[PDB]
């Protein structure tokens, strides 16, 4: 197994927030683009990164990849629900529950980035990341959309120094 397996698993699990968010934004007619990359969130992210002793620019790059992957899922869901509205989730999303999950996923990702900073800067990162993704894609039974979104979300993991 790869040492990035848990970091990638946390990222893949975090991508699934897209399903509740699209389900809510669909009914509420909210823009998918209004996703939170605002100065207050960027500063909080950087202050949380410095608190974990990891590079804020690196962490910001990771979450810039993550948000793009998340929006991409929401757009594909909107595409599916436009073609066949009946396939839309019947159940309302539990966003109070999702809020606490995201907080836990964020912390796990940041502590994992610190806990594996040496590997993320190493030449073996690329091979380790590829093995991690396949494990997570197999173990999480990720479909084509989530696989590609996981690739987008993790494409800067090995840009560490």
């Amino acid at each position: 197994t790869s040492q990035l397996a848990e970091l990638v698993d946390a990222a893949a699990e975090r991508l699934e927030v897209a399903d509740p968010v699209a389900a809510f934004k669909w009914r509420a007619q909210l823009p998918i683009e209004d996703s939170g990359r605002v100065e207050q969130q960027l500063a909080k992210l950087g202050e949380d990164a410095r608190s974990q002793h990891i590079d804020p620019d690196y962490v910001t790059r990771v979450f810039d990849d993550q948000i793009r992957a998340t929006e991409a899922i929401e757009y594909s869901r909107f595409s599916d629900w436009k073609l066949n509205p009946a396939s839309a989730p019947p159940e309302p999303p539990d966003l109070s529950a999702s809020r606490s999950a995201i907080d836990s996923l964020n912390n796990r990702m940041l502590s994992q980035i610190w806990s594996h900073w040496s590997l993320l800067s190493a030449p073996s990162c690329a091979a380790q990341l590829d093995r991690a993704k396949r494990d997570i894609v197999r173990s999480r039974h990720l479909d084509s959309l989530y696989q590609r979104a996981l690739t987008t979300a993790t494409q800067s993991y090995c840009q560490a120094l």
Binding site: V17, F24, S35, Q41, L95, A101, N106
Partner: peptide, 13 residues
Amino acid sequence: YLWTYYELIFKPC
């Protein structure tokens, strides 16, 4: 708005 960039933040409209 409903945000997912860093925190899942939710303001009622």
